[PDB]
Amino acid sequence: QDVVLGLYYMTRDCVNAKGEGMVLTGPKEAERLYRSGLASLHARVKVRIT
Amino acid sequence: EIKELLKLGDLPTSGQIRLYDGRTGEQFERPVTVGYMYMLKLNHLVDDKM
Amino acid sequence: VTEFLKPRLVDIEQVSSTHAKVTLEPLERGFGHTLGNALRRILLSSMPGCAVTEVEIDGVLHEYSTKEGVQEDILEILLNLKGLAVRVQGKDEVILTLNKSGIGPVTAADITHDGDVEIVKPQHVICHLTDENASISMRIKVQRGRGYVPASTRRLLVDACYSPVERIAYNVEAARVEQRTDLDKLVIEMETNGTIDPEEAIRRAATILAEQLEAFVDL
Amino acid sequence: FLKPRLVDIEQVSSTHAKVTLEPLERGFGHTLGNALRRILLSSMPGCAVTEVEIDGVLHEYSTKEGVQEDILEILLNLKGLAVRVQGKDEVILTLNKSGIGPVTAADITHDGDVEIVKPQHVICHLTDENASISMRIKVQRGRGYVPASTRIRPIGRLLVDACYSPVERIAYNVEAARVEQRTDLDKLVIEMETNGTIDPEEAIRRAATILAEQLEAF
Amino acid sequence: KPLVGTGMERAVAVDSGVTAVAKRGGVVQYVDASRIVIKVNEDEMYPGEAGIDIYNLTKYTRSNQNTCINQMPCVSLGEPVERGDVLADGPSTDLGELALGQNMRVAFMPWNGYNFEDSILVSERVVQEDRFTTIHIQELACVSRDTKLGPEEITADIPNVGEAALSKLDESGIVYIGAEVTGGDILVGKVTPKDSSLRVPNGVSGTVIDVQVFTRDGVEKDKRA
């Protein structure tokens, strides 16, 4: 009832963002972009994940 | 009538305003509901129950 | 009235290098978040550094294209170049060359040294080759800047990760001195790209913040 | 890295003013604004009433003949009193008043280095022709919020919950600075709202000094 | 007062009886923190036994649930008052209007799990301003029963106990009115024929605001009584 709301607002997508077409080099890059405010949490990007 | 009375001031009619985070200084990325609710204090005091 | 609990770095215990985890205590009530957020915001998007800005590969002219003999895609080449951590001396921007042929990996050790330019991870693989005739040569341009500048803000354009940090995330938890009730305990976790130490980056960011508050300080 | 300076301080009202910091680099505006706002709201020095000794009053749950208000209400009003004792760290104020009429904060016989910033602050209302009050107000400097139930003697000393915090509302604003030929330079406007017992520039300098001292660890 | 009400707050405030509602209209001749004197108009004054009417307010006193019911005036000196309008606000009353709480500036948002299931996250300004601070007047009784082996006493000398706990006691064994006693302090020093003195319950501070001594007719008296 609160952690599920956080994980549902986090893991979600809308068709627009601060940056959407960008392609990232890993999850750390995604966190850095979200914290720096250069990308919305609901972008649709391509991350490289191991 | 609630929305008209909100218009009488300068507050948004939707009832939701923009709140920034107290510690990180960055906005919450959605309008949140802010207003004056009449909270009570029930006399189920914690020091009378510990 | 003007006295505050001066913190001291209890431990700078390090995971595998460039992954230090610093924790200073005890902070005054509420100062943990101030210090953590200020240091994080400075380390994230305000930090001098050098990163690959743009790259020109002779065989391609478009991000959605390919070259025969290249195992990866052009997007994956740009991703490998984003992670190409480099350290550059006094020159503000240089151009590196990556002439390479023959079947095998294309590591960062096959880039021309050019003297002052030095790669901190020569084992960083950039491309893979599967054809004898596959001749790949690119001109990777590295420029000095501050913070993160996405390619969408500004002849292939690559995102420029100028700041040596890669993931900085503090965590404030409860600490107590002998009698005082509520204090803070800042726990800073930082991973860099190898061009700087995390404990060195912390003092760099602290110096940068302290220089800002020098024209209106009480000395 | 250009460094900011206090270029403007607009004392719009008696209590609240608007300082201005420029030039600020891109991104440093919000960092400095939030750090200084938290430091101002958390750790500024101020003066507050701590202990009150009314003459014929044994405890805060009683009443005195002549006044329109309970002793607890008088203690609350004295808690809402702003004072700017200059040199000392503890001053015993004094108040004597008689006759029908309000007992304002101007009636305090303050010494030389004690300055009441809001004389019109009503403490209590005397409602009798011949009835006087006599309270030995105690003022001392401090920091933060210190309730009377946690500090550390006779049967006539009324402890008051002291709130040593001159500021009440700190709001910063980041907007573009007008440099002759340059962009990406912000401008911080810390709109602070004190209660009059502190200078704005002194508050900003104290906040910056505290932040620099905290950074001195590394 | 509640900013959002229903209009029945005034009816409950007036009709409950906790508010000193004026019986005959007039002009407030003298308003004190413990009484109100109303100069009745000539229209409503009887020919004989006219005089004026005094409303003696009920100050800090204990209710059934150990709360504090205490009236305070809501009128000013020389202010015209009619018939059937409130003069003193009772407990949880604001100008003759039932006010059971404080107008709190709320925000509906998750805040780092501190309002997880039903919890409330309260700013420090709320406790700084003493908005929700409440007075809880509670009484303690020390009955002295004449048991076997002789009767009991309330003398101020307690065996096996130092003078630290007996400092607040007077020479008659009872505690002074106004003492800031904490949990574990001696209030009335009672000794059984061989120490069973009345002590404050643990974990509660307080302030002695009233002492009442009832003595059976036949026991002479004590100097505090």
Side-chain angles (χ1 to χ4, degrees), chain C residues 150-170:
Chain C
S152 301
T153 302
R154 51 186 177 89
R155 313 169 204 85
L156 309 178
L157 291 187
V158 198
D159 304 320
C161 311
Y162 301 118
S163 61
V165 322
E166 203 167 0
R167 170 185 173 270
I168 161 70
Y170 71 96

PDB file of all heavy atoms in Angstrom, chain C residues 150-170:
ATOM      1  N   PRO C 150      23.866  15.756 -22.286  1.00  0.00           N
ATOM      2  CA  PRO C 150      23.317  14.784 -23.239  1.00  0.00           C
ATOM      3  C   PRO C 150      23.473  15.260 -24.674  1.00  0.00           C
ATOM      4  O   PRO C 150      23.526  16.456 -24.969  1.00  0.00           O
ATOM      5  CB  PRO C 150      21.840  14.685 -22.840  1.00  0.00           C
ATOM      6  CG  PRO C 150      21.776  15.222 -21.445  1.00  0.00           C
ATOM      7  CD  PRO C 150      22.837  16.273 -21.372  1.00  0.00           C
ATOM      8  N   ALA C 151      23.556  14.287 -25.583  1.00  0.00           N
ATOM      9  CA  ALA C 151      23.689  14.598 -27.002  1.00  0.00           C
ATOM     10  C   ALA C 151      22.445  15.276 -27.559  1.00  0.00           C
ATOM     11  O   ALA C 151      22.542  16.033 -28.531  1.00  0.00           O
ATOM     12  CB  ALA C 151      23.991  13.326 -27.795  1.00  0.00           C
ATOM     13  N   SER C 152      21.277  15.019 -26.966  1.00  0.00           N
ATOM     14  CA  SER C 152      20.053  15.669 -27.418  1.00  0.00           C
ATOM     15  C   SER C 152      20.055  17.167 -27.140  1.00  0.00           C
ATOM     16  O   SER C 152      19.358  17.912 -27.837  1.00  0.00           O
ATOM     17  CB  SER C 152      18.838  15.020 -26.755  1.00  0.00           C
ATOM     18  OG  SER C 152      18.772  13.636 -27.055  1.00  0.00           O
ATOM     19  N   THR C 153      20.811  17.619 -26.137  1.00  0.00           N
ATOM     20  CA  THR C 153      20.925  19.051 -25.879  1.00  0.00           C
ATOM     21  C   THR C 153      21.623  19.772 -27.025  1.00  0.00           C
ATOM     22  O   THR C 153      21.193  20.859 -27.427  1.00  0.00           O
ATOM     23  CB  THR C 153      21.675  19.290 -24.567  1.00  0.00           C
ATOM     24  OG1 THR C 153      20.992  18.627 -23.497  1.00  0.00           O
ATOM     25  CG2 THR C 153      21.765  20.777 -24.257  1.00  0.00           C
ATOM     26  N   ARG C 154      22.681  19.181 -27.567  1.00  0.00           N
ATOM     27  CA  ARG C 154      23.451  19.800 -28.637  1.00  0.00           C
ATOM     28  C   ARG C 154      23.332  19.004 -29.932  1.00  0.00           C
ATOM     29  O   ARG C 154      23.099  19.569 -31.001  1.00  0.00           O
ATOM     30  CB  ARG C 154      24.918  19.921 -28.224  1.00  0.00           C
ATOM     31  CG  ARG C 154      25.505  18.618 -27.713  1.00  0.00           C
ATOM     32  CD  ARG C 154      26.916  18.803 -27.189  1.00  0.00           C
ATOM     33  NE  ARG C 154      27.444  17.562 -26.636  1.00  0.00           N
ATOM     34  CZ  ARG C 154      28.099  16.649 -27.338  1.00  0.00           C
ATOM     35  NH1 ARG C 154      28.336  16.810 -28.629  1.00  0.00           N
ATOM     36  NH2 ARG C 154      28.525  15.546 -26.731  1.00  0.00           N
ATOM     37  N   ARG C 155      30.190  12.104 -37.895  1.00  0.00           N
ATOM     38  CA  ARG C 155      29.760  13.205 -37.043  1.00  0.00           C
ATOM     39  C   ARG C 155      28.705  12.731 -36.054  1.00  0.00           C
ATOM     40  O   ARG C 155      27.615  13.297 -35.974  1.00  0.00           O
ATOM     41  CB  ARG C 155      29.215  14.356 -37.889  1.00  0.00           C
ATOM     42  CG  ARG C 155      30.095  14.716 -39.072  1.00  0.00           C
ATOM     43  CD  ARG C 155      29.390  15.674 -40.015  1.00  0.00           C
ATOM     44  NE  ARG C 155      29.928  15.585 -41.366  1.00  0.00           N
ATOM     45  CZ  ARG C 155      29.535  14.696 -42.267  1.00  0.00           C
ATOM     46  NH1 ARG C 155      28.596  13.805 -41.994  1.00  0.00           N
ATOM     47  NH2 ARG C 155      30.100  14.696 -43.471  1.00  0.00           N
ATOM     48  N   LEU C 156      29.037  11.685 -35.304  1.00  0.00           N
ATOM     49  CA  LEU C 156      28.120  11.104 -34.336  1.00  0.00           C
ATOM     50  C   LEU C 156      28.262  11.804 -32.992  1.00  0.00           C
ATOM     51  O   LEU C 156      29.373  11.990 -32.490  1.00  0.00           O
ATOM     52  CB  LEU C 156      28.389   9.608 -34.179  1.00  0.00           C
ATOM     53  CG  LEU C 156      28.440   8.804 -35.479  1.00  0.00           C
ATOM     54  CD1 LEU C 156      28.762   7.343 -35.198  1.00  0.00           C
ATOM     55  CD2 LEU C 156      27.131   8.931 -36.241  1.00  0.00           C
ATOM     56  N   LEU C 157      27.130  12.188 -32.412  1.00  0.00           N
ATOM     57  CA  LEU C 157      27.104  12.867 -31.124  1.00  0.00           C
ATOM     58  C   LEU C 157      26.987  11.839 -30.008  1.00  0.00           C
ATOM     59  O   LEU C 157      26.117  10.963 -30.048  1.00  0.00           O
ATOM     60  CB  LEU C 157      25.950  13.865 -31.050  1.00  0.00           C
ATOM     61  CG  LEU C 157      26.089  15.098 -31.943  1.00  0.00           C
ATOM     62  CD1 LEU C 157      24.985  16.101 -31.653  1.00  0.00           C
ATOM     63  CD2 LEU C 157      27.459  15.735 -31.765  1.00  0.00           C
ATOM     64  N   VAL C 158      27.866  11.952 -29.017  1.00  0.00           N
ATOM     65  CA  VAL C 158      27.938  11.021 -27.899  1.00  0.00           C
ATOM     66  C   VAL C 158      27.685  11.797 -26.617  1.00  0.00           C
ATOM     67  O   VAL C 158      28.131  12.941 -26.478  1.00  0.00           O
ATOM     68  CB  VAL C 158      29.305  10.308 -27.842  1.00  0.00           C
ATOM     69  CG1 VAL C 158      29.218   9.058 -26.994  1.00  0.00           C
ATOM     70  CG2 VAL C 158      29.795   9.977 -29.239  1.00  0.00           C
ATOM     71  N   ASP C 159      26.952  11.183 -25.689  1.00  0.00           N
ATOM     72  CA  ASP C 159      26.741  11.798 -24.387  1.00  0.00           C
ATOM     73  C   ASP C 159      28.072  11.960 -23.667  1.00  0.00           C
ATOM     74  O   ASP C 159      28.911  11.055 -23.674  1.00  0.00           O
ATOM     75  CB  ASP C 159      25.780  10.958 -23.546  1.00  0.00           C
ATOM     76  CG  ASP C 159      24.453  10.728 -24.238  1.00  0.00           C
ATOM     77  OD1 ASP C 159      23.941  11.677 -24.868  1.00  0.00           O
ATOM     78  OD2 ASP C 159      23.933   9.594 -24.171  1.00  0.00           O
ATOM     79  N   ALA C 160      28.268  13.121 -23.051  1.00  0.00           N
ATOM     80  CA  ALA C 160      29.543  13.480 -22.441  1.00  0.00           C
ATOM     81  C   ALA C 160      29.405  13.391 -20.926  1.00  0.00           C
ATOM     82  O   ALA C 160      28.753  14.230 -20.300  1.00  0.00           O
ATOM     83  CB  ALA C 160      29.974  14.873 -22.883  1.00  0.00           C
ATOM     84  N   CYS C 161      30.024  12.366 -20.339  1.00  0.00           N
ATOM     85  CA  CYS C 161      30.033  12.184 -18.888  1.00  0.00           C
ATOM     86  C   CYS C 161      31.332  12.772 -18.347  1.00  0.00           C
ATOM     87  O   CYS C 161      32.294  12.066 -18.041  1.00  0.00           O
ATOM     88  CB  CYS C 161      29.886  10.711 -18.530  1.00  0.00           C
ATOM     89  SG  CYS C 161      28.545   9.858 -19.384  1.00  0.00           S
ATOM     90  N   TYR C 162      31.354  14.104 -18.244  1.00  0.00           N
ATOM     91  CA  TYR C 162      32.562  14.797 -17.805  1.00  0.00           C
ATOM     92  C   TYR C 162      32.926  14.430 -16.371  1.00  0.00           C
ATOM     93  O   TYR C 162      34.101  14.207 -16.060  1.00  0.00           O
ATOM     94  CB  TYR C 162      32.382  16.309 -17.931  1.00  0.00           C
ATOM     95  CG  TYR C 162      32.083  16.800 -19.328  1.00  0.00           C
ATOM     96  CD1 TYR C 162      30.894  17.456 -19.613  1.00  0.00           C
ATOM     97  CD2 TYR C 162      32.997  16.629 -20.356  1.00  0.00           C
ATOM     98  CE1 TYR C 162      30.619  17.915 -20.883  1.00  0.00           C
ATOM     99  CE2 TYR C 162      32.729  17.084 -21.631  1.00  0.00           C
ATOM    100  CZ  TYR C 162      31.540  17.729 -21.887  1.00  0.00           C
ATOM    101  OH  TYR C 162      31.267  18.182 -23.155  1.00  0.00           O
ATOM    102  N   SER C 163      31.936  14.370 -15.489  1.00  0.00           N
ATOM    103  CA  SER C 163      32.208  14.139 -14.077  1.00  0.00           C
ATOM    104  C   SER C 163      32.784  12.742 -13.872  1.00  0.00           C
ATOM    105  O   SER C 163      32.241  11.769 -14.411  1.00  0.00           O
ATOM    106  CB  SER C 163      30.933  14.305 -13.253  1.00  0.00           C
ATOM    107  OG  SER C 163      29.951  13.363 -13.645  1.00  0.00           O
ATOM    108  N   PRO C 164      33.880  12.602 -13.122  1.00  0.00           N
ATOM    109  CA  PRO C 164      34.449  11.265 -12.895  1.00  0.00           C
ATOM    110  C   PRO C 164      33.539  10.335 -12.116  1.00  0.00           C
ATOM    111  O   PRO C 164      33.735   9.116 -12.183  1.00  0.00           O
ATOM    112  CB  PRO C 164      35.738  11.558 -12.116  1.00  0.00           C
ATOM    113  CG  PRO C 164      36.045  12.993 -12.398  1.00  0.00           C
ATOM    114  CD  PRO C 164      34.717  13.663 -12.540  1.00  0.00           C
ATOM    115  N   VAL C 165      32.559  10.860 -11.378  1.00  0.00           N
ATOM    116  CA  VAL C 165      31.681  10.003 -10.595  1.00  0.00           C
ATOM    117  C   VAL C 165      30.750   9.233 -11.523  1.00  0.00           C
ATOM    118  O   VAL C 165      30.507   9.624 -12.673  1.00  0.00           O
ATOM    119  CB  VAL C 165      30.886  10.823  -9.562  1.00  0.00           C
ATOM    120  CG1 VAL C 165      31.753  11.927  -8.987  1.00  0.00           C
ATOM    121  CG2 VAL C 165      29.621  11.393 -10.178  1.00  0.00           C
ATOM    122  N   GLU C 166      30.243   8.114 -11.028  1.00  0.00           N
ATOM    123  CA  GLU C 166      29.328   7.261 -11.775  1.00  0.00           C
ATOM    124  C   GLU C 166      28.047   6.970 -11.015  1.00  0.00           C
ATOM    125  O   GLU C 166      26.984   6.848 -11.629  1.00  0.00           O
ATOM    126  CB  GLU C 166      30.028   5.946 -12.144  1.00  0.00           C
ATOM    127  CG  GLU C 166      29.424   5.220 -13.335  1.00  0.00           C
ATOM    128  CD  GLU C 166      30.325   4.116 -13.860  1.00  0.00           C
ATOM    129  OE1 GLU C 166      31.419   3.919 -13.291  1.00  0.00           O
ATOM    130  OE2 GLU C 166      29.941   3.446 -14.841  1.00  0.00           O
ATOM    131  N   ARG C 167      28.120   6.859  -9.689  1.00  0.00           N
ATOM    132  CA  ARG C 167      26.927   6.706  -8.861  1.00  0.00           C
ATOM    133  C   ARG C 167      27.256   7.227  -7.470  1.00  0.00           C
ATOM    134  O   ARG C 167      28.082   6.634  -6.770  1.00  0.00           O
ATOM    135  CB  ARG C 167      26.474   5.254  -8.804  1.00  0.00           C
ATOM    136  CG  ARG C 167      25.394   5.010  -7.767  1.00  0.00           C
ATOM    137  CD  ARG C 167      25.051   3.540  -7.642  1.00  0.00           C
ATOM    138  NE  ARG C 167      24.145   3.301  -6.526  1.00  0.00           N
ATOM    139  CZ  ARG C 167      24.539   3.039  -5.289  1.00  0.00           C
ATOM    140  NH1 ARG C 167      25.821   2.955  -4.975  1.00  0.00           N
ATOM    141  NH2 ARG C 167      23.624   2.855  -4.342  1.00  0.00           N
ATOM    142  N   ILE C 168      26.617   8.323  -7.077  1.00  0.00           N
ATOM    143  CA  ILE C 168      26.788   8.912  -5.755  1.00  0.00           C
ATOM    144  C   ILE C 168      25.423   8.937  -5.082  1.00  0.00           C
ATOM    145  O   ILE C 168      24.458   9.468  -5.644  1.00  0.00           O
ATOM    146  CB  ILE C 168      27.400  10.320  -5.833  1.00  0.00           C
ATOM    147  CG1 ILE C 168      27.154  11.092  -4.536  1.00  0.00           C
ATOM    148  CG2 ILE C 168      26.862  11.076  -7.036  1.00  0.00           C
ATOM    149  CD1 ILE C 168      27.943  10.577  -3.360  1.00  0.00           C
ATOM    150  N   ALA C 169      25.342   8.360  -3.883  1.00  0.00           N
ATOM    151  CA  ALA C 169      24.069   8.258  -3.172  1.00  0.00           C
ATOM    152  C   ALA C 169      24.368   8.187  -1.679  1.00  0.00           C
ATOM    153  O   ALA C 169      24.907   7.185  -1.199  1.00  0.00           O
ATOM    154  CB  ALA C 169      23.276   7.046  -3.641  1.00  0.00           C
ATOM    155  N   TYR C 170      24.016   9.245  -0.955  1.00  0.00           N
ATOM    156  CA  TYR C 170      24.235   9.275   0.481  1.00  0.00           C
ATOM    157  C   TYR C 170      23.110   8.535   1.201  1.00  0.00           C
ATOM    158  O   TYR C 170      22.151   8.050   0.594  1.00  0.00           O
ATOM    159  CB  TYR C 170      24.348  10.716   0.972  1.00  0.00           C
ATOM    160  CG  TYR C 170      23.052  11.491   0.943  1.00  0.00           C
ATOM    161  CD1 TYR C 170      22.259  11.600   2.077  1.00  0.00           C
ATOM    162  CD2 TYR C 170      22.624  12.122  -0.216  1.00  0.00           C
ATOM    163  CE1 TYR C 170      21.075  12.306   2.054  1.00  0.00           C
ATOM    164  CE2 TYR C 170      21.444  12.832  -0.246  1.00  0.00           C
ATOM    165  CZ  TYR C 170      20.673  12.921   0.891  1.00  0.00           C
ATOM    166  OH  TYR C 170      19.495  13.628   0.862  1.00  0.00           O
TER     167      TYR C 170
END
